[PDB]
Design a binder for this molecule. Sequence first.
Ligand SMILES: Nc1ncnc2c1ncn2[C@@H]1O[C@H](COP(=O)(O)OP(=O)(O)OP(=O)(O)O)[C@@H](O)[C@H]1O
Ligand SMILES: Nc1ncnc2c1ncn2[C@@H]1O[C@H](COP(=O)(O)OP(=O)(O)O)[C@@H](O)[C@H]1O
Ligand SMILES: Nc1ncnc2c1ncn2[C@@H]1O[C@H](COP(=O)(O)OP(=O)(O)O)[C@@H](O)[C@H]1O
Ligand SMILES: Nc1ncnc2c1ncn2[C@@H]1O[C@H](COP(=O)(O)OP(=O)(O)O)[C@@H](O)[C@H]1O
Ligand SMILES: [Mg+2]
Ligand SMILES: [Mg+2]
Lengths: 54, 198, 1604, 54
Amino acid sequence: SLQPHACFRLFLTMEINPKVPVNLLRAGRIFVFEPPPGVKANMLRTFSSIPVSR
Amino acid sequence: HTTASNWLHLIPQTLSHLKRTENIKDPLFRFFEREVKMGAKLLQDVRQDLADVVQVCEGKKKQTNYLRTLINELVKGILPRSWSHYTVPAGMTVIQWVSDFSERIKQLQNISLAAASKELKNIHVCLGGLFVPEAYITATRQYVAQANSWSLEELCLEVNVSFGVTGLKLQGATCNNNKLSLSNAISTALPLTQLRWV
Amino acid sequence: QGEMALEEFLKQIREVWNTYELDLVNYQNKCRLIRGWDDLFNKVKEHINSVSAMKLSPYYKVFEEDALSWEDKLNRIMALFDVWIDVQRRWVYLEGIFTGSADIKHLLPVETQRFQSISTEFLALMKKVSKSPLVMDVLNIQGVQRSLERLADLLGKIQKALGEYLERERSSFPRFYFVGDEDLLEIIGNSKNVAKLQKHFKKMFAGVSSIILNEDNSVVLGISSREGEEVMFKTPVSITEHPKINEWLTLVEKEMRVTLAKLLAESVTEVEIFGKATSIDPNTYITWIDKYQAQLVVLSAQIAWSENVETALSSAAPLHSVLSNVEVTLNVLADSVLMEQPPLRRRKLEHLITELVHQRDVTRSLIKSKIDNAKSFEWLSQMRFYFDPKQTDVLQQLSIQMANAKFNYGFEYLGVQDKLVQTPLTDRCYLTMTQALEARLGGSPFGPAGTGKTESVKALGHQLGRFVLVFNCDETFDFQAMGRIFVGLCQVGAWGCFDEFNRLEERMLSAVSQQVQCIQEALREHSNPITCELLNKQVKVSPDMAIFITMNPGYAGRSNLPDNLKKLFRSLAMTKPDRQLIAQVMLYSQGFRTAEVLANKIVPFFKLCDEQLSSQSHYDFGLRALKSVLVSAGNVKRERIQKIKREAENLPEQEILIQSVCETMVPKLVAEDIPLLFSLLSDVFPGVQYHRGEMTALREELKKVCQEMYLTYGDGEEVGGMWVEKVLQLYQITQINHGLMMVGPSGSGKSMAWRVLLKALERLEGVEGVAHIIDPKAISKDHLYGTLDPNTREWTDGLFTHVLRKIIDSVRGELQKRQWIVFDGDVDPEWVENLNSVLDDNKLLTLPNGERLSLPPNVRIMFEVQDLKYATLATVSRCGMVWFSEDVLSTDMIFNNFLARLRSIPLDEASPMLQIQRDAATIMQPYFTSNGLVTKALEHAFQLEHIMDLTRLRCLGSLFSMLHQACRNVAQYNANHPDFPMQIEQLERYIQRYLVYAILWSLSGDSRLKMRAELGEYIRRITTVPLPTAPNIPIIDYEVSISGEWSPWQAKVPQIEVETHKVAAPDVVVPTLDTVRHEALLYTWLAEHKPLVLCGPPGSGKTMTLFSALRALPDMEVVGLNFSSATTPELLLKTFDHYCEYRRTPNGVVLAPVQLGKWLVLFCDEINLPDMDKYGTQRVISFIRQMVEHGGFYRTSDQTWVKLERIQFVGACNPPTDPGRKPLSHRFLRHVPVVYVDYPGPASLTQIYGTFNRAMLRLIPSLRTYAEPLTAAMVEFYTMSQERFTQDTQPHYIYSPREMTRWVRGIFEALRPLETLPVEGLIRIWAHEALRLFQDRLVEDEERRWTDENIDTVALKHFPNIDREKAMSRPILYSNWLSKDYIPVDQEELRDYVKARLKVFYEEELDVPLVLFNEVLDHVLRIDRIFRQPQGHLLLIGVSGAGKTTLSRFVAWMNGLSVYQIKVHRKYTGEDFDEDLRTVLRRSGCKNEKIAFIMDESNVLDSGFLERMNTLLANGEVPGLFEGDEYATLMTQCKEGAQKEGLMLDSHEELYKWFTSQVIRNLHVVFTMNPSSEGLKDRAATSPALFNRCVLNWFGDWSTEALY
Amino acid sequence: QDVESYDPVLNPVLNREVRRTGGRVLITLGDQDIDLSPSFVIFLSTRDPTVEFP
Ligand SMILES: Nc1ncnc2c1ncn2[C@@H]1O[C@H](COP(=O)(O)OP(=O)(O)OP(=O)(O)O)[C@@H](O)[C@H]1O
Ligand SMILES: Nc1ncnc2c1ncn2[C@@H]1O[C@H](COP(=O)(O)OP(=O)(O)O)[C@@H](O)[C@H]1O
Ligand SMILES: Nc1ncnc2c1ncn2[C@@H]1O[C@H](COP(=O)(O)OP(=O)(O)O)[C@@H](O)[C@H]1O
Ligand SMILES: Nc1ncnc2c1ncn2[C@@H]1O[C@H](COP(=O)(O)OP(=O)(O)O)[C@@H](O)[C@H]1O
Ligand SMILES: [Mg+2]
Ligand SMILES: [Mg+2]
């Protein structure tokens, strides 16, 4: 029920729980964060997360 | 209810009874006595519950609330909380739990028969079928310690493939001349494990 | 001469009271207050005791008037002084704050003016009381009671209203955040007195328990700890400069730190000049220890060792030299501790030995490997200490270090505390938590309870010198409360050690994660006048913050930590502590030559004990138990050494440790584990042996107390040996322990055990012993512990919190007595986990306010429980168990206690009653000895089976009550025959048969007919008592006459014929054998005002039998109470409020009925229904058990013991096998006898309803020949319908003689104004009533057709030669609209009439068209039939949109009823529902108008709706609905309505009775709901009235006939 | 809109439980008597397909 600013993003962080409303699941865009598949992907995310200057 | 009555009729065909068998100072005698007593108590409550379910499912007897809970648990296939008194691996199913409990009752019957004829020292026990294998290990260590009049804290364990235990299974290894070799087999059964205290 | 001696004692009392004046001392040249109240209260109480002793015996009857005058004057002066001490205590600190504190009139002007007025009034009273110091003169002032009450009330009001200034005052001195509101008020008020502050420094500081002052109280010389250790400041602080309290307290807390720093410098200089030599002198070493405090000594030793090791590693020979010096020092310590020392110096020695053995182990590990440089991590890992004298800042001279974590000592005076054995696990914990602290992350160890988590955190804080706080948080710890304690910790610079953090309401956990993150960011900013935002306010954060978390993963299914909060804490798993090392170090420190041998034999002993012993829920063999054993071993070694010295030598250390193990662990064992544990002891320690007894003084005092209060005492092997040994074990555990439990089955004698032990300890030690018995489940957790108001930050004390706070304050001298707080309930982790920090070694109770109430040494918190199958290991481990087995208490001692209580203490309370009691006791003596007859009969009763679990003590107390009734009957017979008294042989031959009758009706009172006959057969076989010679008739069908022979009840029951006016009236009971037996037994119960339970199937006749029994007792008033699934003790409290009043007496408050001389009896109709908690308890049942056993309950308004005066209970319940029933607890079933009333059966039912039908068939004399076949057909149809329409198909398929009574009443009401009827018409009306009672409740067409077939074949079988076509038909409709009478009508004329009435109805009320068909016609006739009858409620089951409420509205309009609907909207809550109910009740009762209260299932929002609807449907009134203003308005309206009707009534009870009659006659409730698979069962469980007193009609969906 | 939180004040309107005061048309609503014009319609909206109605 609102029309917001252009550069406004609302971030909802939650655990995977059936109690989350289906209305909110349909309205929002869903991102799933999981342990990585594979040692290569694990090391890739570790190296991307650690800044280069460190 | 007809299928439930048939299943509960065929369940106690592997369950008959257990001898009650108790004045001995050795830990082995009293440990076996209390284990057989606990097994007999569990068997008699399970037998009473089975008889109640059979009579109220095929016959003339009303239904109580605890009986309704037991019947619902049996139909859903989950173990009732009252029956599960020992350790059940990661929430098993009643279908295999009745077989496991029947195996434990048969083992305890074998202990009772051996005790009816020290005499219990030469028997071989599978540690999976015992309610308290850690108590069995403590009891045999205490027995050898009292018999040899040694210390209770400076006793090591020598293992060969004066106490024999069965049912132990390896994981990713093979036993050959008491030497371990790495293998790709998921589980190799040990034929007989000998526990000698030095 | 005795009377003259008593008169001389009275004269001495008069002289000592006329010579006693109040002692007055000047208070700062302002007023002369009264001090010294202890002697006055002691004199008053001993005078009361002397008067009470003189009243009992021997010549009180001559001095009654003046004795009573002295008694009530003493009570009056005691009450006045009890109010006076409280008001003066409040006034002192209120005057102090309002005078010393500034900017109070500028901030609280109305409060300052109020206190100015109150102070003027109190100074006027002070001048008046100082004019005449005599106590009688003080009592002579009129209005002292009301003046003191007003003073106390207004002082409390201003005390509550002053709370806003408390936070502003707390912002000045940081430490005040841990001090409560009233305590802080005392601190501010008594600032100019100082000497009254000494009982709050324990809460304010760490170890500072008192402050050393000068003679003038102007300069603070020093501070002192709890154990007498004192620290004298180098530069004293002066109050004579007139600083404020916060200012000089800040000066004190700074001076303490600088003094500890200076003494640390001097002490480390002394240790440096000591340790440079290879040998040390024990004399100078002991003098140094006496010179310096415990923490300073330990710190200096650590500094010296770290410096020596660093200099050795700076450079292998120096490391060997350091190890050799450490070993030489440790040998000196051991030699010094092997002899006798003062306790403080000995504890310093013990701490030194622990630290030195840790240093020796560290040096051994460092020298075992090859270490060369000091930068190696093998040395860098261990904690080290650095002292730099060159640092000019005295606070930062000492720098504690570990692996890359520099620390500064807080220099907080910890006093002495208790050192911790530095295990490798403890070192790992130290390293991990100090790495977390360096990283500005709070620590978080976790694991099972008893691994040493909170004690490790506290030991780390003490090593760092930080002020540590342990909080036992629970679900009541809110976000605001955690913000408050965080801001307090931020101000003070302390550590937090929140214990059991996982039970903190996940949403609140996530919310407080933000505050934790803010604290972490503030500390990181400090690491580089900082502030952080807590509760939307900025606060300075000291750099010594640490939030530590202690939690058990999955201990009781507690809440789980969110990842957001988990990332802010450094975790640590710790499950296996080094018990071997702990035991070795503890024993070597306490002094034991074979320390290593004892440890190596005791730790595997505990490991073997945890496995070889049986598995029980109350066994704990963990580290806490091991440490308790070690401490008790040290104490008993000290005691034995002192006993030997009373006469170094050698002592049996093995035997000492065996004695400690036995004294700590023997009582918790079951009866089958004593030889097993003795075998374990003999195996581990061969020559162990043990000693017991040697308690002659306490044992003989216990015997004297047992003989005094009619108990059975044994010598150890005698009858009471097990019980007396258990009492001795309880005494030992109370002596050497902190919190106790008495785990055992009901009736084991634990209550009598601890009561007798308390009285014996009283009369032995001379200290007063007071016991507080609390049921923790009879009240809410909020009422038990406390409640924080969500709006304003105010604290309302709970029951246990209030009791402990009263003991702590000790205004009545409570600290010098012996207090035993007893929790007489059952343990579950909802409330017992709040006592985890209580039962621990912290000895302090934590509250959400941050106020931590310490536990004084005279208080022992004791538990009296039945089992621990729901208690967790965290609370099982902390207590000392005493196992009271069932065979500990044998039935012969209960028999002995009963015989003694019969022989003495006459029932009508030498006396003829006492003589008859003694005669009966000596007659029944042979039957109670050993086996006899009663024990064998009770064993057979146990072998039988009953409707409830038969405990021995329930039926045994019931038998005792029946025997008391026999004695009362003998007394009444003697009174009725004054000329010829009771012959002794007749009394013998009468009691010898009454005993058999009583044991029969006691043991078999709750069993079926065949099993009570079986018990009768067993008793007949087993006893030598004259019995009736009837082979067929059981003994249970006989009564014992007062002449002493057997008579049947078949002679008692007559063949009475009831009048036609009352054919099926509610109060009409036709007598039968079961009926007369049941009311005779009920009268036998109720004559002693004993509780009871009427168990049986619904509709069996339980309340009818109860009311028939109560109608023979004129001095009892019965009140109906209906219980549902959601029943709370608030209902019983509302009933007590409505029908009883709270009085005030000098021996406590009492609760008595308003109508004097009558015993109010409470009829709980569904006592079985209240829901059972997930830990297996019921609040209502626990409440009723508490007030039945202890004779009263607790009022939650002000935490006062309210004692029931004339209140008794009767209960009704379905058997526990019914779908909605949950079995009652054995601890409640112990007191209540239960009688099983069953269905009458066919043989009884035939005559019961044959009488009714014969009476009913008298209006028409030509039909009187068909009564017997009519009853036969009625009984056969009811029976054959009951067989298959059971509760398993549908939850509402219950059948009972209530339907038969309704059937007979309906036939009679149809037969009354009709006066002439053929047999065809009789069969037609019988069939119509049968259909209306047996077909309407059905669900399916197949069973409806089955009942139609049943009624057809029953009429055909029992009614031959009849016109079947004329009698039976399809429509069978009956109506009274077409004519004036209830004449059967055809379908078409009825349809035309209903069409015309609906035509009129369309323009009148509802203009909605309807379509008519046969089902609608049947529905409207059924609804009209129900609406005609009084109290006619409906329960319509059907799909939505079927027209149920529209048809109800149409029928209500046509019958003249008024339609009411509640008009639910958004936020329509319970108060709005109550307002609607009040309006409906007023319109129905006061205005005398019909109301059709239509209600739909959608109108239900909460369970309160169903509770009030249940009460209204079953009783016609709702207690607690009207109270106060609206109650008086209802009374005025009811009086006006009675005047309008024509009845002149007064008072309140009869007006309320008439109002209830008007409601029950003029109010009809229609409940419409959708059918459901489980909704109907849930509604039946949550409201039995909807299925009992509401007529059910299953409308359902429209049939195919209806649709077509 | 948002008939998920249905308010039971609309039950007499939806059921058309209407009185007849001569030529005038009278309905009840809460605690007041309301005259309704014959040209009155009401629509209830929903953005949630996966909603359950009693
Ligand atoms: N040593 C004794 N000798 C004789 N009678 C005893 C003895 N101890 C207890 N009794 C009797 O046993 C009765 C029940 O015992 P008690 O009141 O101590 O209950 P309890 O075991 O604490 O029960 P609960 O577990 O239900 O609280 C007492 O009323 C008393 O008459
Ligand atoms: N390393 C140790 N040295 C000496 N005593 C210890 C040690 N660890 C634990 N204890 C004792 O064992 C008991 C364990 O309590 P603890 O586990 O700290 O409570 P919680 O379970 O709340 O953490 C404590 O009373 C403590 O005195
Ligand atoms: N001996 C009897 N004489 C007359 N009526 C009886 C008799 N026994 C049962 N009744 C009938 O049974 C009903 C009693 O049921 P009630 O006591 O209310 O059961 P509950 O209290 O369990 O609801 C009464 O309506 C009464 O008419
Ligand atoms: N016999 C009937 N003929 C015509 N309409 C009917 C009939 N019974 C019910 N209705 C319709 O049902 C509506 C009434 O709903 P309601 O009485 O609330 O149903 P229920 O009582 O089953 O909840 C009316 O608007 C009416 O149009
Ligand atoms: Mg803890
Ligand atoms: Mg008790």
